[PDB]
Each structure stands twice: as C-alpha cells, then as structure tokens.
Amino acid sequence: KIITSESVGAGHPDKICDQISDAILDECLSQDQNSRVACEVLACNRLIVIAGEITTHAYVDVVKTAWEIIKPLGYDENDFTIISNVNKQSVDIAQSVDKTNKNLIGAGDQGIVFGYACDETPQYMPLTSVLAHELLKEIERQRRSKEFIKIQADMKSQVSIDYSNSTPLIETMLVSIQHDEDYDVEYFNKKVSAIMEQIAKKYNLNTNFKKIINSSGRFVIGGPIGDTGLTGRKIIVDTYGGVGHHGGGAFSGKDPTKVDRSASYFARWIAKNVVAAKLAKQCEIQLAFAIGQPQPVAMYVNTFNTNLIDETKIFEAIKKSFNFDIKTFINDLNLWTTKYLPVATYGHFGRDDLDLSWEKLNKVEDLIKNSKH
Amino acid sequence: KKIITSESVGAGHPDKICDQISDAILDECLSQDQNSRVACEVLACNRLIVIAGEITTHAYVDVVKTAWEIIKPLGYDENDFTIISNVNKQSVNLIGAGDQGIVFGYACDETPQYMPLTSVLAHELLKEIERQRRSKEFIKIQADMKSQVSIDYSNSTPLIETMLVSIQHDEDYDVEYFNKKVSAIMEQIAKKYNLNTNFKKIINSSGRFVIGGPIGDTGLTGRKIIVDTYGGVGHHGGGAFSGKDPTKVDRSASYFARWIAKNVVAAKLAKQCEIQLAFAIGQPQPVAMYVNTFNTNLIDETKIFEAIKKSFNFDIKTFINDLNLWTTKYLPVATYGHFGRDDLDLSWEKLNKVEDLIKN
Ligand SMILES: Nc1ncnc2c1ncn2[C@@H]1O[C@H](COP(=O)(O)OP(=O)(O)OP(=O)(O)O)[C@@H](O)[C@H]1O
Ligand SMILES: Nc1ncnc2c1ncn2[C@@H]1O[C@H](COP(=O)(O)OP(=O)(O)OP(=O)(O)O)[C@@H](O)[C@H]1O
C-alpha cells in the first residue's frame, strides 16, 4: 500500500500565479478590510495577464505588485510583459453576500469544502504532504541564502510512503529542480541527498529509500517560459496532497467572503481540534454552501473508524463547540487581518513555521467538555 | 445523518467555456495530426479571452475561430468578446510519462453509470435545463448555471436532502414561471432514479443572476476538476484534463484508472473501487498502484490486485492505444463530467474487461 503526495516551489508557473493573486489580495486587505477580491492570473511564456473582479477603496498597482513577486525568482523587467484586465465584482453577487442588514454575510458562492486532520505528524497532516513541502521549503531557503548555488526557483517534489505495516516506511523521494547550464551534478545530487536524509531523520523514518533527482536529466528552461501557469491549478498541493477529499475551489486571490477559502480553513480548524482532542486519529469534515445563505446547507463528519469515543457524540461536540455563522467564523479566525502570501507556497495547512488562526488548538478544551453530558 | 453533496456547472459557466475551448482546440489538432502534443490553457475575464499553452502539430488550427464556435451557441456574438492567442506553436524507446503525478479512478454500483448518485443527478439536472433552453421549452434563461445535489445516505435506500440550482435569467423573467419550470425539472429527475420527491428546493438563492458568463465572474481551464471527476466522493491528484493530449498521463492514466475501477465493480468484485496510480516523468509504467474497495469487496482484497495485474496492460503507449485516445473526441466530456457517460460511447466506460477479471 503506497500513498504519494507532491509539492511545487515558488518558481513553479502555477505557484507564481497563486503568489501574485494573494499578494494583490494582501495589498487590498491592508488598506480596505471590506474589499471584495477574486484575482486570477495567467502566466503564458513571457505574457502575464492579471484578471478577476476587485471592488475596494484601496490604491493598488496590480502590475507593480506582480513584479515584486517575480524579481526574487529572480526575473527582471526584460523577462515579461505584465498586463491587467482586472474588472469590478458583479453588483448581482455583492447584493447577496453584503446584506442590507450589516450583521449577516452570505456565502460568496455555492460549493463543497473538505477539512482533514490526522495524528501522523505534529502538524496533524499526512506524512507524504509534510515531507514533500519541507523538502522544497528547505531547498528554496538555501537558494535565496546561496547555501545551495546554481539552482533556480522552479522545482517539484513527490514523496511515496509504504503504509503496508503499522510503522510507516519511505518508499521513494523524487525531486526536479531547475538548475544553471554550468551546474556540478556531484554537488547538486549530494546537496539534494543530504536535505532528503535530514528531513527523513527529523520524522525518525528509514533513510535507505530510493532517491530520484532530476529524472528528466535536463531542467534549465523553467517558469512560465516553455509553458503556462494559472491561479488555483495546485489545489491538491495547497490542501492534503490527496489523502483527503476536495470540493474543487482554489484559495489564492479570494477574500474571506468566498466560502471556498474561509470555510475550507474553518473545516481544517474543526478536523485538527477533533484529532488534537484525541477523539479520533483521522477526521474529515465536508461542508456545503448556498450563494447568499449565512450558514452551511449540509455538514458530514467522517472519523474513518479511528474514533476513540462514540461517532455520534463527536458530531454533537462539534455543533456545541463551533459557531457555523459565516461572518462569525471569519471574525473568529481573523481572516480580514491575516496575510495570505505565506500560504501561497508550501501548503495552506500544517504550518508550524507560521501562526495561522485555523491551525490553533484553542477548541480542544471545548470539544472535551461538549462530548460529555 | 450522513449527507454527501456534489455540484455541476452548465456550458455557459466561465470555467467550462474555457474547458470547452481547450478540448475543441485539442480535437481540431488530433483530427489532422494524431502525433500532436497539446497543452492548451484559456483565460476568460470580462470581455477578454486569452488562449495560451504549448502545441506541436502538423495541423492547421485557427485557435481564435475555434473559440468562437464554442461561444456563439451560448448566446454571444462577434461584438461580445476580444479573443487573442499567445499559444506557443512548433512542428515535430517507447513513450514515457508526460509528467510526474497521481491519478485516481473510482466506480460504484449506486447508478447504471457506475457513478455516485449526487454527481449523476447534479449533471442530469443542468443537462436537462440546457436541452430545454436550446429547444425554447424553457424561455428567458441563459447558458450560465450551477447545480448542487445533497443526498442523505443514513439508511440503505438513499434519500434526496436538497436540490440547489442557480440559472442566469433575462431582466424580464416571470419568477412564478421560472420557479415552476425548475421545480418540475427537479422532480422529473428525482423520479427518473425513483427517489423521494419531497426534498428541499433552493432556486436562485442569490435573488438576481442577469450578469453571468465571464462578465462578473472569471474563467480558467481546469478549475472544475472535481466536477469533471467524482464530485468529492473520490480522491483527486490535482491534474486537470481539458486541453491535454494522451501523452499527459494526468488525463490518459485517469481514464485508464476509471476503466479498471468500473470493470472491477461491474465484475461484482466490489460495490465501490478506488485506484491510485503514481507516475515518474520519462518512465513507461506507473511507479506505484493502490486499490481501495472500502471494505465492500466480495472477494479477498489480495486476489483483486492480482486479477487487475493479469487483466490489464500498464504500459502507457499500450493503454493509450487500447482506449483509442488518439481517435477520441474530447469536447463532449468538457461538459457534464468525463465519467459515467451513458449519453456518450467512451472507451474507458466499456465493460470489455469483466470476463477477464472473473477468469484471473
Ligand atoms: N449574481 C450571481 N448570482 C448567483 N451566482 C452568480 C452570480 N454571478 C455569478 N454567479 C456564479 O458564480 C460562479 C462562480 O464560479 P466558480 O464556482 O468556478 O467559482 P470561482 O470563484 O470562479 O472559483 P472556482 O472556479 O475555483 O470555484 C460563476 O461562474 C457564476 O455561475
Ligand atoms: N525537464 C523537466 N523535468 C521534470 N519536471 C519538469 C521539467 N520541465 C518542467 N518540469 C515541471 O513540469 C511542470 C509542468 O507540469 P505540472 O504538472 O506541474 O503542470 P500544472 O499546470 O502545474 O498542473 P495541472 O495542469 O495538472 O493542474 C513545470 O511547471 C515544471 O515544474
């Protein structure tokens, strides 16, 4: 039984787009917390089109902001044309979300979001996901600091784990990194091999696993240059690298009124606190929404027969422990005042390197109280 | 109370406009050159449609002309959009995987389509509404529209909890007429799968939907990957299908995985079957395979793994030829799901491996 997860670096075309989308969002929320943002980005060859709907009192040069994401990766003013066709939000959607009564907020769209957690890691995330991110996250750190030279930002990881026996085993770690023409392969493979082992030993896993380093054998042309990138085409890499289910919504470039995002975060927060409360080893939460309605239309809790108390009492504890009003859980998770660029890379979930509201175990003591009466 | 929910989107949905244009361009390429490489992405923002991606082909393709053929049927005319192309174009051992990646194949016995009830009902609802719009049996509505069907799986006979529909309408619609027409289509669909008829109906919950299409939303290729597949009941690896030729395992392996799952459940070896396949760039066979029967297996789990290995060739060039992916039209699957198409005749939906799975 082999389960596999993937991640992509800051220089991946899709992740360039996700970063530019959240960077524009962050710049909007800083000035106007009441601003509606649905920012999509196409990066095709040397053309970057910034698009979507934005209504805001904020002054934002969308193009200037794109260049600030792009120079670090590190392209210059000669590398791209960057044009904006950014429109305004539909007044038809706005009337349904922003009520006349100032006290409810209605769902930004219809949709289904999944929240997942498990006890396999301190991050309460599947091992394969954590290892795939941490690998690229360490490589990108060394590239910016020049501890790992003659590599560029574009890169991918795939970590396969053999779950046959109850103690997990690393089967394969795969890495593709964009490199310079004049790289030393010895140096390159040693650097990658060392990072792969340092990471395996961190989660005290076997160290003898198969290492697949630049399997294509040439990776100089990266980024959008041969290629295409769009906002929200890495939604499984943003979440639970499979292991969990997904409803289809992308996160980057969307303000908190888009339930696709804020409800997904809210769902992560329940799942994580349920497993942290030791009520289950794995927990998946499905939430469904209707456009303009203030509360979820349907909710499903699945503990995968890893529940350590009665399944039914877990459903009750959650209903008693969490407010499901959309304006309320948005304020509770402080989504108006959270910077989203940091989660545009290396996953939205299990960020022990960040301090995200939806990762805090501040509901464990309420779930324990409400599972018993 | 166990409530599972799936959604679908109509042909006029911005993302699905993009998926249609991407597969229409693919189809136009394969028609002339079966050896052509196509990775076509489309942005539709306000009145600008940008067609982009990589194409190597001997085929003559007016990418812009093809986009207009998808768009005119939906309402729009030559005055409604600017349509520009930035598509990068070129001329041209056995075949290795187009990329690394993970693909999931799912099947179950809940429907004749071997697909989750929530998915089938969500598609069939929009598929019937779109039919009546073109035939003018349902007037003063436009092509952009969404469905959400929630089913209560508590007891062993499934029960409709909620049907949701948003349809873009004209300024001068009659709400009485509109709500009656939707209510009637919702019931005729429920009765088709002989389900309860008393479920909750949510019709245009926003309360105004005149501004639709890419005006007041934005649309990209491959942002409806869960609506293209198993509407949340299955797992997904992250790859979108539309605009990609068969050498992209993301697509062809996903189809190959559907074909195993469906034939496994059709063979009566399980009620539900999920197949995970993992790939390495430049490798001719899958690197890992995982089989999940959700404890609904009717033979030993281990003997199902053996039967599949004996019953199917996992060479990527071989399963591409076996499923005839070079000669398959993909535009029809750009709307209303890639899987459980009893309204189409797809190679990866054929139960032509049941007798081989039983033998092995
Ligand atoms: N006034 C309105 N009332 C109701 N629905 C609307 C209105 N305006 C637009 N919509 C619908 O909202 C949809 C949003 O599409 P979609 O579900 O793709 O969300 P998104 O924010 O574009 O991101 P993603 O595609 O990742 O979900 C539009 O395509 C349209 O069908
Ligand atoms: N020589 C190479 N070897 C390995 N990987 C490469 C090579 N050249 C490019 N790549 C990687 O392959 C990627 C293209 O495939 P990828 O699956 O990442 O596409 P995507 O658009 O992100 O995904 P999807 O369309 O399935 O949502 C490039 O962005 C790059 O990261």
Tab-separated table of N, CA and C in Angstrom, chain B residues 208-285:
chain	number	residue	atom	x	y	z
B	208	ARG	N	-30.800	37.454	-7.757
B	208	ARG	CA	-30.614	38.170	-9.053
B	208	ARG	C	-29.382	37.577	-9.740
B	209	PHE	N	-29.533	37.139	-10.990
B	209	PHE	CA	-28.465	36.496	-11.798
B	209	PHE	C	-28.742	36.816	-13.271
B	210	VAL	N	-28.400	38.046	-13.674
B	210	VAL	CA	-28.517	38.562	-15.072
B	210	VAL	C	-27.110	38.654	-15.676
B	211	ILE	N	-26.165	39.237	-14.920
B	211	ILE	CA	-24.710	39.294	-15.251
B	211	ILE	C	-24.109	37.910	-14.983
B	212	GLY	N	-23.820	37.155	-16.043
B	212	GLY	CA	-23.206	35.818	-15.963
B	212	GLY	C	-22.035	35.718	-16.906
B	213	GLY	N	-21.718	34.511	-17.376
B	213	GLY	CA	-20.550	34.229	-18.225
B	213	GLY	C	-19.277	34.794	-17.597
B	214	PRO	N	-18.269	35.152	-18.425
B	214	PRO	CA	-17.058	35.791	-17.927
B	214	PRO	C	-17.280	37.248	-17.498
B	215	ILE	N	-18.458	37.825	-17.752
B	215	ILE	CA	-18.812	39.177	-17.232
B	215	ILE	C	-19.189	38.983	-15.759
B	216	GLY	N	-18.336	39.387	-14.816
B	216	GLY	CA	-18.719	39.382	-13.389
B	216	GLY	C	-18.473	38.040	-12.701
B	217	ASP	N	-18.026	37.027	-13.450
B	217	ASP	CA	-17.032	36.037	-12.973
B	217	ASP	C	-15.798	36.063	-13.893
B	218	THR	N	-14.843	35.166	-13.653
B	218	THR	CA	-13.642	34.941	-14.493
B	218	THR	C	-13.469	33.437	-14.631
B	219	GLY	N	-12.910	32.961	-15.732
B	219	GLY	CA	-12.878	31.517	-16.026
B	219	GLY	C	-11.516	31.085	-16.505
B	220	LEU	N	-10.998	29.979	-15.975
B	220	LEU	CA	-9.734	29.366	-16.450
B	220	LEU	C	-9.981	27.896	-16.753
B	221	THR	N	-9.227	27.339	-17.696
B	221	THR	CA	-9.124	25.880	-17.935
B	221	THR	C	-8.750	25.197	-16.620
B	222	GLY	N	-9.485	24.143	-16.262
B	222	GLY	CA	-9.084	23.164	-15.232
B	222	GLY	C	-9.295	23.673	-13.819
B	223	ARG	N	-10.334	24.480	-13.601
B	223	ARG	CA	-10.781	24.934	-12.261
B	223	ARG	C	-12.092	24.232	-11.882
B	224	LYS	N	-12.498	23.202	-12.637
B	224	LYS	CA	-13.682	22.366	-12.311
B	224	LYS	C	-13.288	20.886	-12.339
B	225	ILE	N	-12.143	20.539	-11.740
B	225	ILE	CA	-11.507	19.191	-11.832
B	225	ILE	C	-12.309	18.189	-10.988
B	226	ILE	N	-13.029	18.651	-9.959
B	226	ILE	CA	-13.832	17.772	-9.058
B	226	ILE	C	-15.196	17.525	-9.705
B	227	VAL	N	-15.681	18.503	-10.474
B	227	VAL	CA	-16.948	18.425	-11.248
B	227	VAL	C	-16.704	17.586	-12.509
B	228	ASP	N	-15.461	17.528	-12.987
B	228	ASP	CA	-15.053	16.711	-14.167
B	228	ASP	C	-14.964	15.228	-13.791
B	229	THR	N	-14.793	14.914	-12.506
B	229	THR	CA	-14.431	13.559	-11.993
B	229	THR	C	-15.593	13.007	-11.158
B	230	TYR	N	-15.440	12.888	-9.831
B	230	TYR	CA	-16.366	12.133	-8.942
B	230	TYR	C	-17.010	13.059	-7.900
B	231	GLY	N	-17.090	14.357	-8.172
B	231	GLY	CA	-17.794	15.348	-7.333
B	231	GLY	C	-17.541	15.189	-5.844
B	232	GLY	N	-16.313	14.845	-5.417
B	232	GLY	CA	-15.904	14.772	-3.994
B	232	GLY	C	-15.931	13.389	-3.339
B	233	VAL	N	-16.661	12.410	-3.891
B	233	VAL	CA	-16.812	11.042	-3.309
B	233	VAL	C	-15.471	10.305	-3.434
B	234	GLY	N	-14.708	10.614	-4.487
B	234	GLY	CA	-13.376	10.040	-4.770
B	234	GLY	C	-12.262	10.988	-4.359
B	235	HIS	N	-11.007	10.545	-4.454
B	235	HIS	CA	-9.801	11.389	-4.250
B	235	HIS	C	-9.365	11.925	-5.617
B	236	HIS	N	-8.557	12.980	-5.617
B	236	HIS	CA	-8.014	13.615	-6.842
B	236	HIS	C	-6.535	13.929	-6.608
B	237	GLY	N	-5.718	13.822	-7.655
B	237	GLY	CA	-4.260	14.044	-7.615
B	237	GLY	C	-3.875	15.482	-7.913
B	238	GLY	N	-4.741	16.223	-8.613
B	238	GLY	CA	-4.630	17.680	-8.826
B	238	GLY	C	-4.643	18.079	-10.296
B	239	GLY	N	-4.391	17.140	-11.210
B	239	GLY	CA	-4.302	17.389	-12.660
B	239	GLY	C	-5.660	17.646	-13.296
B	240	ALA	N	-5.749	18.676	-14.141
B	240	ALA	CA	-6.941	18.974	-14.969
B	240	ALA	C	-6.779	18.257	-16.311
B	241	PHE	N	-7.886	18.001	-17.008
B	241	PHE	CA	-7.938	17.139	-18.217
B	241	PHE	C	-7.947	17.987	-19.488
B	242	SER	N	-8.825	18.991	-19.564
B	242	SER	CA	-9.137	19.721	-20.819
B	242	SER	C	-7.865	20.338	-21.402
B	243	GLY	N	-7.674	20.181	-22.711
B	243	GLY	CA	-6.600	20.842	-23.475
B	243	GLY	C	-5.325	20.019	-23.517
B	244	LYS	N	-5.337	18.816	-22.945
B	244	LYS	CA	-4.143	17.941	-22.820
B	244	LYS	C	-4.316	16.712	-23.713
B	245	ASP	N	-3.314	16.404	-24.538
B	245	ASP	CA	-3.289	15.216	-25.431
B	245	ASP	C	-3.034	13.963	-24.589
B	246	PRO	N	-3.224	12.745	-25.148
B	246	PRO	CA	-2.999	11.497	-24.412
B	246	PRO	C	-1.625	11.253	-23.764
B	247	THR	N	-0.544	11.894	-24.208
B	247	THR	CA	0.820	11.698	-23.626
B	247	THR	C	0.901	12.318	-22.226
B	248	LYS	N	-0.051	13.174	-21.843
B	248	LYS	CA	-0.176	13.699	-20.455
B	248	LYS	C	-0.904	12.636	-19.637
B	249	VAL	N	-0.166	11.846	-18.849
B	249	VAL	CA	-0.719	10.739	-18.005
B	249	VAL	C	-1.850	11.277	-17.115
B	250	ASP	N	-1.678	12.476	-16.542
B	250	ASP	CA	-2.729	13.224	-15.799
B	250	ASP	C	-4.112	12.837	-16.335
B	251	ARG	N	-4.270	12.868	-17.663
B	251	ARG	CA	-5.551	12.574	-18.354
B	251	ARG	C	-5.652	11.067	-18.616
B	252	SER	N	-4.787	10.510	-19.470
B	252	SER	CA	-4.952	9.159	-20.076
B	252	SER	C	-4.940	8.079	-18.987
B	253	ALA	N	-4.088	8.247	-17.969
B	253	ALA	CA	-3.976	7.337	-16.805
B	253	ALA	C	-5.239	7.449	-15.937
B	254	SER	N	-5.785	8.654	-15.757
B	254	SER	CA	-7.050	8.885	-15.008
B	254	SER	C	-8.179	8.093	-15.676
B	255	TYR	N	-8.273	8.179	-17.005
B	255	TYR	CA	-9.236	7.420	-17.851
B	255	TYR	C	-8.981	5.910	-17.712
B	256	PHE	N	-7.716	5.497	-17.791
B	256	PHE	CA	-7.272	4.089	-17.637
B	256	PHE	C	-7.706	3.583	-16.255
B	257	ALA	N	-7.536	4.404	-15.212
B	257	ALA	CA	-7.918	4.119	-13.805
B	257	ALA	C	-9.443	3.995	-13.672
B	258	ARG	N	-10.208	4.865	-14.332
B	258	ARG	CA	-11.698	4.779	-14.355
B	258	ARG	C	-12.107	3.409	-14.913
B	259	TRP	N	-11.422	2.963	-15.968
B	259	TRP	CA	-11.700	1.735	-16.759
B	259	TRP	C	-11.513	0.487	-15.891
B	260	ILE	N	-10.463	0.452	-15.066
B	260	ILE	CA	-10.203	-0.652	-14.088
B	260	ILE	C	-11.319	-0.639	-13.039
B	261	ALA	N	-11.474	0.473	-12.308
B	261	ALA	CA	-12.484	0.657	-11.231
B	261	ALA	C	-13.853	0.176	-11.720
B	262	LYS	N	-14.311	0.702	-12.857
B	262	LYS	CA	-15.649	0.377	-13.423
B	262	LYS	C	-15.756	-1.135	-13.690
B	263	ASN	N	-14.734	-1.750	-14.295
B	263	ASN	CA	-14.755	-3.189	-14.677
B	263	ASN	C	-14.673	-4.063	-13.418
B	264	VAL	N	-13.996	-3.588	-12.368
B	264	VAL	CA	-13.877	-4.280	-11.048
B	264	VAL	C	-15.262	-4.339	-10.394
B	265	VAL	N	-15.999	-3.224	-10.377
B	265	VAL	CA	-17.364	-3.161	-9.763
B	265	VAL	C	-18.371	-3.907	-10.659
B	266	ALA	N	-18.262	-3.784	-11.990
B	266	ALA	CA	-19.109	-4.496	-12.985
B	266	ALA	C	-18.901	-6.019	-12.869
B	267	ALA	N	-17.678	-6.455	-12.550
B	267	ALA	CA	-17.296	-7.873	-12.349
B	267	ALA	C	-17.880	-8.390	-11.030
B	268	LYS	N	-18.455	-7.498	-10.212
B	268	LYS	CA	-19.109	-7.794	-8.905
B	268	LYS	C	-18.044	-8.193	-7.869
B	269	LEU	N	-16.808	-7.713	-8.023
B	269	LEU	CA	-15.702	-7.977	-7.067
B	269	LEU	C	-15.800	-6.994	-5.892
B	270	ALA	N	-16.548	-5.897	-6.051
B	270	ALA	CA	-16.766	-4.861	-5.010
B	270	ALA	C	-17.981	-4.000	-5.387
B	271	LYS	N	-18.518	-3.217	-4.436
B	271	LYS	CA	-19.615	-2.237	-4.713
B	271	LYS	C	-19.013	-0.862	-5.054
B	272	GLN	N	-17.878	-0.522	-4.438
B	272	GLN	CA	-17.075	0.701	-4.682
B	272	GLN	C	-15.624	0.268	-4.916
B	273	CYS	N	-14.900	0.934	-5.817
B	273	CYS	CA	-13.465	0.657	-6.089
B	273	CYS	C	-12.752	1.958	-6.464
B	274	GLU	N	-11.706	2.311	-5.716
B	274	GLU	CA	-10.819	3.472	-5.984
B	274	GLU	C	-9.417	2.953	-6.297
B	275	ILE	N	-8.798	3.480	-7.357
B	275	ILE	CA	-7.456	3.059	-7.854
B	275	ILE	C	-6.565	4.301	-7.913
B	276	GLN	N	-5.516	4.336	-7.093
B	276	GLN	CA	-4.454	5.377	-7.124
B	276	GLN	C	-3.310	4.867	-8.001
B	277	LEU	N	-2.894	5.664	-8.989
B	277	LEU	CA	-1.705	5.409	-9.842
B	277	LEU	C	-0.769	6.618	-9.728
B	278	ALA	N	0.527	6.367	-9.509
B	278	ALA	CA	1.608	7.379	-9.417
B	278	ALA	C	2.551	7.210	-10.614
B	279	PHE	N	3.121	8.313	-11.104
B	279	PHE	CA	3.971	8.345	-12.322
B	279	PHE	C	5.256	9.131	-12.040
B	280	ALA	N	6.317	8.758	-12.758
B	280	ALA	CA	7.621	9.448	-12.825
B	280	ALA	C	7.812	9.898	-14.275
B	281	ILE	N	8.234	11.151	-14.489
B	281	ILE	CA	8.466	11.739	-15.843
B	281	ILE	C	9.523	10.899	-16.591
B	282	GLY	N	9.138	10.344	-17.743
B	282	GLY	CA	10.050	9.608	-18.641
B	282	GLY	C	10.049	8.110	-18.394
B	283	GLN	N	9.228	7.620	-17.457
B	283	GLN	CA	9.092	6.173	-17.118
B	283	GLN	C	7.857	5.598	-17.802
B	284	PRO	N	7.963	4.415	-18.452
B	284	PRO	CA	6.903	3.911	-19.330
B	284	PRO	C	5.729	3.247	-18.590
B	285	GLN	N	5.906	2.924	-17.302
B	285	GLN	CA	4.892	2.251	-16.450
B	285	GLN	C	4.667	3.057	-15.172
